């Protein structure tokens, strides 16, 4: 029953703090985010004078 | 050309006769275009 439950929920403190460092350094190493405007052009009357 | 005038041989086009006796004057060229009018439907294909 809870022998292995409360065993494992404590033994894997190494997993949890390794996950902490993994997510932190991943957040440091995140890349850029770019959006595409989509299949729709945008234009108008340019030479206003 | 205008005789019996103190002023003569001025520059420009004459003010009386443009008929010129010849056929006509050739003016010709090409064109690009830009406009916006109703066209075919791209809503039918909203995905690549």
UniProtKB/TrEMBL annotation, chain B:
Entry's localization field: Virion
Residue numbers of the full-length protein present here: 438 to 485 of 776
Superkingdom of the organism of origin: Viruses
Protein name from the UniProt record: Outer capsid protein VP5*
Positions occupied by motif YGL motif: 11-13
